[PDB]
Amino acid sequence: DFHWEEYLKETGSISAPSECFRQSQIPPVNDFKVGMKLEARDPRNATSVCIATVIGITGARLRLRLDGSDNRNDFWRLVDSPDIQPVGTCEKEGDLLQPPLGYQMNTSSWPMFLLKTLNGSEMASATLFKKEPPKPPLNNFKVGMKLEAIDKKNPYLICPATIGDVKGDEVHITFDGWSGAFDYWCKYDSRDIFPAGWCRLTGDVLQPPGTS
Questions:
Q1: Which among 65, 73, 167, 181 would be 20 to 30 A from 154, CA to CA?
Q2: 3 and 88 fall within a common domain
Q3: Using CB atoms within 10 A of its CB, is residue 132 exposed (0-12), middle (13-18) or buried (19+)?
Q4: What family does the database annotate?
């Protein structure tokens, strides 16, 4: 099994301090249940908020699917992500819920599909949406530091990664044991990167380093 304390000694490296990340020192608890409804910004259309159903639970993350669309574009969001909110938030903020990109019906049917889908469903209580963590004021990451990062090619996977480079407010995430094809640059305050030990603390799944 994988253990950071041992891996760090094996690779002769150190893990990035938790203060470097925009993640809560004490991870948020996940009280959501599969089947619950909520609002989520369309991963394929940021300007649109759609109705989403919880398909799965993993650690402090939710596997979501936009109601009215197929099951081939599911995405993962932390319970304290600003991209998810309780039903009713969109309108309360003066916006209008949008059909998902990939909606299987005619746009005009959206109004009734909405009531239908939300009818007799369990709306995730606001109590389930945890407080957003504070943003570290500066990028404190240093090249070589290790962490846990989401493989954006396979979002369900969180893997051992290293800060390959630092440029201003950006960091170059590289995946231990895998080809550069999975690497990516992101803002230091990205919600897709976590301090070593995050998966263990949240009950999520941390992939072992690549065997290639």
A1: 167
A2: no
A3: middle
A4: Belongs to the SCM family.
